[PDB]
A and B are shown apart, each in its own frame.
Chain A
Amino acid sequence: VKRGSKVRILRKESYWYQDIGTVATIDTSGIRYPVVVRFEKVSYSGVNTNNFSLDEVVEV
């Protein structure tokens, strides 16, 4: 993906699994979960952002 794009989450235990977020940053370093995605819904913990990997994220 690229920064600022809209993505549909594919991590089955995510709060936002099959919901749309927007990509904040992507880390070039060897990070296991380099895609930073922000959402408009908060999770049950009140967090509105999470890190993801490329194989857990699809552009819409």
Chain B
Amino acid sequence: SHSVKVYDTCIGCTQCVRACPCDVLEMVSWDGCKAGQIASAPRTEDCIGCKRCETACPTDFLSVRVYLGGETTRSMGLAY
């Protein structure tokens, strides 16, 4: 699977979670940013590696980082 990380620079804008085409990301409660929430990556086995989350992220360097790893049927986006 791919490895998706969220760094504590996340401002809790939820944009990565809305952009994710495979429901990999969700919002969990936090206290390190004004929004009170941080992105989370509980379902990275479903991550296809599109990096739409990274595109959506507005922090100067990406709070969400996708690290392409071992390929599977899910992460290769194979319908066959």
Interface on A for B, CB 8 Å cutoff? 11, 13-16, 27, 29-33, 43, 45, 47, 50-51
Contact = CB atoms under 8 A, between A and B. Distances in A.
Given A32-B8, A33-B9, A51-B9, A43 B32 contact: no
B34 A13 contact: no
Interface residues of B, number: 11
Nearest to B35: A31
29 contacts: A11-B60, A13-B60, A13-B61, A14-B60, A14-B61, A15-B60, A15-B61, A16-B60, A27-B34, A29-B34, A30-B31, A30-B32, A31-B32, A31-B33, A31-B34, A32-B8, A32-B9, A32-B32, A32-B33, A33-B9, A33-B33, A43-B60, A45-B58, A47-B60, A50-B59, A50-B60, A51-B9, A51-B11, A51-B59
Contacts of A43: 60
Interface of B: 8-9, 11, 31-34, 58-61
A10 to B, nearest CB: 13
Classify the secondary structure of B's interface with A.
loop
Contacts of A31: 32-34
A54 B4 CA distance: 28
B16 to A, nearest CB: 13
B58 A47 contact: yes
